[PDB]
Enzyme design. Structure first.
Site, short mmCIF file in Angstrom:
data_model
loop_
_atom_site.label_atom_id
_atom_site.label_comp_id
_atom_site.label_asym_id
_atom_site.label_seq_id
_atom_site.Cartn_x
_atom_site.Cartn_y
_atom_site.Cartn_z
N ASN A 1 23.30 -24.45 -44.52
CA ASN A 1 22.32 -24.68 -43.42
C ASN A 1 22.35 -23.64 -42.31
O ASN A 1 21.35 -23.41 -41.60
CB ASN A 1 22.63 -26.02 -42.77
CG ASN A 1 22.15 -27.25 -43.64
OD1 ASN A 1 22.11 -28.39 -43.15
ND2 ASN A 1 21.78 -27.00 -44.87
N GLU B 1 26.42 -17.72 -46.82
CA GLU B 1 25.57 -17.93 -48.00
C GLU B 1 24.21 -17.27 -47.74
O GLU B 1 23.32 -17.91 -47.20
CB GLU B 1 25.40 -19.44 -48.24
CG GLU B 1 26.76 -20.20 -48.30
CD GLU B 1 26.75 -21.59 -48.99
OE1 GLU B 1 25.68 -22.10 -49.38
OE2 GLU B 1 27.85 -22.19 -49.08
#
Ligand SMILES: Cn1cnc2c1c(=O)n(CCCn1c(=O)c3nc[nH]c3n(C)c1=O)c(=O)n2C
Ligand SMILES: Cn1cnc2c1c(=O)n(CCCn1c(=O)c3nc[nH]c3n(C)c1=O)c(=O)n2C
Length: 376
Positions: free
Chosen positions: A80, A120
């Site tokens: 996120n 990520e």
């Protein structure tokens, strides 16, 4: 000889009823390492993200009062969080220095043994091609800052680990493998989310081997292909930690007659009543679906279970599959297992009737940590 690293997530505290998981719910004998997901970043400095993180840190690190051998790490980033703060922070020696300084301070104040980078990913999701090598400079500078700090306060060095991609394309655009391997203490390979409803067909969250019908880039999506890729491309076996999921991905079947691996699907399956996550069920949520009379399958080529009922299908992992994967990892001489996440295993023991933490306990027995000391 083998590590067992467990992720704890700081939003599990908001799950209802038996799903609520706080640091006190962690058995301190269970894992060799525990990772706290997640910290954030503000003006290039590590920071907390929940109102009560400082309280949770204390209880999480306090678990080291019960097991002198336990080590804890703080994970920064995650899915996120995305890439924008990481891209700005790595972009100059000054921004990196500001960060690395904020981290030594933070980790020492709240008593973590190390940082786990969960970017990520460098080079994807909006991160520009230069972040691949800049992620290496960051990690090296961090490792080296940890080394100097261990010498000028005379304690064991803070540890640096990283959660890293399993998708071949994400790997290629993200990591200088041999160079990162020198500076990281461990490499946590995210060998899960290898299939899910985004593909349009049923498939396994974390299969060990490829399906006989897997061709082209679909032959890459299994733990065997992924770990061998990391190993052959420069990461030492002993630093490589295999990711184990304690949850599964669910799907809506397009036709409840076709229930095989590869059956067409029309979308994510439903959120469970505890984790409330669209397309995902915690292991303990899946045990409810099984006691609801779901038909149990076994994907024999990939060594993982699946289950279905009406138009809902789920591919997941159980005690049988964790054990198979764990013998496999021992044979291939990897350094250990990493588990996402301790709050998704059947921690109360009441959903699955397999004892407390059935999934992670299987790994504890199988990696020969059953005899590991648990003393102050
Ligand atoms: C910060 N945060 C607050 N609530 C959250 C999150 C969050 O990051 N994710 C995404 C977590 C996605 N994720 C990882 O970031 C991750 N890193 C290593 N392994 C991971 N896995 C399995 C995983 O789902 C959430 O789902 N929720 C509900
Ligand atoms: C871990 N994760 C959490 N949310 C994600 C992902 C993700 O990896 N991808 C890219 C890879 C393919 N993929 C997933 O792996 C995935 N995992 C959960 N949901 C996902 N989706 C919608 C998806 O496309 C995402 O797009 N999203 C929205």
């Amino acid at each position: 000889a083998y590590q067992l690293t467990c992720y704890f997530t700081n939003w599990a505290q908001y799950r209802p009823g038996l799903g609520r998981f706080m640091p006190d719910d962690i058995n301190p004998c269970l894992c060799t390492h525990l990772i706290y997901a997640f910290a954030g970043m503000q003006n290039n400095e590590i920071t907390t993200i929940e109102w009560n993180d400082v309280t949770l840190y204390q209880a999480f690190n306090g678990l080291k009062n019960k097991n002198s051998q336990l080590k804890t790490l703080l994970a920064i980033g995650g899915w996120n969080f995305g890439t924008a703060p990481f891209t700005a922070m790595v972009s100059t020696p000054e921004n990196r220095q500001t960060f690395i300084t904020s981290v030594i301070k933070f980790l020492r104040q709240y008593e973590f043994d190390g940082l786990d980078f969960d970017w990520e990913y460098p080079g994807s999701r909006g991160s520009p091609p230069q972040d691949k090598h800049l992620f290496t400079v960051l990690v090296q500078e961090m490792r080296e800052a940890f080394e100097q700090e261990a010498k000028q306060i005379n304690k064991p060095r803070l540890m640096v680990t990283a959660a890293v991609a399993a998708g071949i394309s994400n790997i290629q655009s993200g990591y200088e493998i041999p160079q990162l391997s020198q500076y990281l203490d461990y490499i946590h390979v995210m060998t899960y989310d290898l299939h899910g409803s985004w593909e349009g067909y049923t498939g396994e969250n974390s299969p060990l081997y490829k399906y006989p019908t897997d061709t082209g880039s679909n032959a890459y999506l299994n733990v065997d292909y992924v770990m061998n890729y990391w190993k052959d491309n420069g990461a030492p076996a002993e630093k490589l930690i295999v990711g184990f999921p304690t949850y599964g991905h669910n799907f809506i079947l397009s036709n409840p007659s076709n229930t095989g691996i590869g059956a067409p699907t029309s979308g994510a399956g439903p959120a469970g009543p505890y984790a409330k996550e669209s397309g995902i069920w915690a292991y303990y949520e899946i045990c409810t679906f099984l006691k609801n009379g779901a038909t149990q399958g076994w994907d024999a080529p990939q060594e993982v279970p699946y289950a279905y009922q009406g138009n809902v299908w789920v591919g997941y992992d159980n005690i049988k599959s964790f054990d198979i994967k764990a013998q496999w990892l021992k044979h291939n001489k990897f350094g250990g297992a990493m588990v996402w996440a301790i709050d998704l295993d059947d921690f109360t023991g009441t959903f699955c009737n397999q004892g407390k933490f059935p999934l992670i306990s299987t790994l504890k027995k199988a990696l020969g940590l059953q005899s590991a000391s648990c003393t102050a």
